[PDB]
């Protein structure tokens, strides 16, 4: 499979999902910084990304988790730029289940980048039998994420009541799945 390269997974001519590396720390940090205000609306962690060193620490931990298959953290490269992150936040090996996460900088939204990335990951891990069940869980009012999940052929399984905390408040999540 020539799409599985040493540096990452080639989705198409424009998108590669890069294995994390320290060299990406600067670009990743700047991207988060540019999007911090909007990102804080939908994710907890951006509120605390204050220096490049925080992105270095994230990369270091992501590489450890990737090595041990605890997670699969990938940096989305669109053309020449890092666009965001797509991940299996959690890989449950016993139950062959992967929980998906993602984000894109504002300048990279509306381009199908995450949809294309997810479809590729599901082909690679799902059609090979490594993962049986893929899950997207996100706060109910996250309109763009809901659209992405449905666009990728996921099915709504239910609402997880008061399951995600942002800034001390618990919010309901939709849980979507795609089963091979
Ligand atoms: C969730 C998020 C990644 C969605 O980004 P996105 O760009 O809408 O994601 P997709 O890859 O599904 O792209 C779909 C959009 O690209 C457009 N489109 C353009 N080219 C396309 C292509 N090649 N394939 C599919 N759609 C394409 C679609 O029409 C759609 O645009 P629309 O929203 O104007 O209808 C983004 O809103 C984000 O990063 N949000 C903050 C982080 C977050 O909330 N993460 C999830 C935590 S719960
Ligand atoms: N410090 C950091 N720097 C850069 N990216 C980071 C990061 N911390 C996390 N991410 C990435 O942010 C994305 C979204 O992860 S998330 O934990 O904020 N939320 C969810 O997954 C929802 N679906 C809710 C749920 O799954 O319950 C993932 O791709 C992570 O790898």
From TrEMBL:
Residues annotated to bind AMP: 45, 87, 89
Sites where the protein binds CoA: 42, 102, 104, 110, 112, 114-115, 138, 142, 145, 148, 151
Domain N-acetyltransferase, first and last residues per copy: 35-176
Binding site residues for acetyl-CoA: 42, 102, 104, 110, 112, 114-115, 142, 145, 148, 151
Lineage top rank: taxon: Bacteria
Protein name: MccE protein
Origin species: Escherichia coli
Organism placement in taxonomy: Bacteria, Pseudomonadati, Pseudomonadota, Gammaproteobacteria, Enterobacterales
Gene this chain is encoded by: mccE
């Amino acid at each position: 499979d020539v799409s599985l390269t040493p540096s990452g997974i080639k989705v198409n001519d424009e998108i590669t999902l890069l294995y994390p590396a320290l060299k990406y720390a600067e670009e990743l940090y700047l991207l988060i910084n540019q999007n911090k205000i909007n990102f804080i609306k939908s994710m907890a962690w951006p509120a605390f990304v204050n220096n490049i060193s925080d992105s270095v620490s994230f990369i270091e931990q992501s590489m450890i988790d990737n090595q041990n298959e605890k997670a699969l953290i990938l940096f989305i490269k669109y053309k020449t730029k890092i666009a965001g992150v797509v991940s299996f936040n959690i890989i449950d090996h016993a139950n062959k289940t992967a929980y998906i996460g993602y984000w894109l900088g504002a300048n990279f939204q509306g381009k199908g980048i995450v949809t294309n990335a997810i479809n590729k990951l599901i082909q690679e891990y799902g059609d090979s039998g490594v993962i049986k069940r893929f899950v997207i869980k996100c706060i109910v009012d996250n309109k763009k994420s809901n659209a992405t999940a449905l666009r990728c052929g996921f099915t709504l399984e239910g609402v997880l009541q008061k399951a995600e905390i942002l800034n001390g408040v618990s919010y309901d999540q939709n849980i979507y799945s795609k089963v091979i």
